[PDB]
């Protein structure tokens with residue numbers, strides 16, 4: 366069950382989110398990625414930021430060795446972190462990711478964020494006052510380096526993440542653009558449904574990939590605890606009983622029926638296996654409008670620190 370991208374490649378519409386907080390041991394990412402493939406996941410979403418690409422790569426490698434899957438069956442995504450936006454840093458960053466995951470190519474390589482940060486191996490460079498150090502980079506030059514990564518065959522497709530309409534247009538209107546972004550991976554859920562950005566992306570044949578589709582991990586570092594818990598929403602819960610499903614399954618099915626590729630993170634075997642049941646049932650057009658009405662313009666990631674960044678997408 367895939368969507369054809371604007372470069373001709375195919376992307377499975379349900380993806381496994383691999384991020385876990387640093388308090389979760391790295392061995393779990395290896396275990397649960399195997400479980401995800403066992404359950405039927407084929408789209409696997411990782412990033413240099415996540416400090417798990419070696420474990421995710423080991424799991425893919427293990428499921429190829431036991432004959433469960435072939436490399437051609439797995440859609441693996443990595444992401445260029447914001448400290449490597451400068452063009453000369455892009456290809457070595459991808460090559461590092463490939464070496465850690467022990468893969469010859471990624472199916473998808475993304476610009477993780479438009480907010481460039483100070484170049485270096487430090488993921489969160491902070492000044493003497495503990496403030497994240499920004500960098501200024503022409504993201505069109507970053508994209509040019511991404512296009513060369515596709516030409517070199519190190520990435521089958523290239524796309525962006527956390528871009529707004531204006532930043533997307535910056536790429537689409539770039540003189541001599543060779544490859545359009547195949548996708549824009551953004552926070553998207555019934556409380557933040559991105560209908561405006563989704564309509565724009567559809568008009569440009571760019572796939573919207575939804576993260577925090579299940580309402581985020583509510584990490585204490587970025588999520589206000591008083592924010593609403595998505596999966597406790599009464600409309601989601603009432604729809605779950607109607608269909609004899611779970612609120613999470615409603616949230617995932619919501620995205621599939623509106624043309625959105627949806628990610629789902631779980632480090633729990635039974636919830637991993639439950640999430641692939643999204644293909645078993647179907648919401649009515651009335652159910653969809655009911656979920657459409659839940660929009661709160663609530664993004665679970667906030668930071669007034671990044672609000673000052675020139676490229677802050679919100």
Ligand SMILES: NC(=O)c1ccc[n+]([C@@H]2O[C@H](COP(=O)([O-])OP(=O)(O)OC[C@H]3O[C@@H](n4cnc5c(N)ncnc54)[C@H](OP(=O)(O)O)[C@@H]3O)[C@@H](O)[C@H]2O)c1
Pocket residue numbers: 381382383384385410411477526527550551575576577578579580581582596611613614628629630631632633636637639640
């Ligand atoms: N490009 C970006 O900037 C960006 C940002 C954030 C995330 N992402 C990616 O998107 C992926 C998912 O987003 P997310 O990290 O915010 O997590 P999420 O998909 O919104 O899931 C949130 C929580 O829901 C739980 N869950 C999973 N299945 C469930 C089910 N059937 N019933 C009840 N609860 C369930 C999970 O807890 P359990 O683990 O206990 O099951 C999970 O922690 C991430 O892993 C990451 O790959 C990308």
Ligand SMILES: COc1cccc(NC(=O)c2ccccc2OCc2c(C)noc2C)c1
Pocket residue numbers: 477478479480488489527587666671678
């Ligand atoms: C070095 O640390 C940085 C620097 C910048 C941004 C972040 N972002 C986050 O911590 C984060 C945490 C949880 C969910 C989503 C998150 O960010 C999504 C996002 C948006 C929107 N724009 O860029 C990104 C990335 C972390």
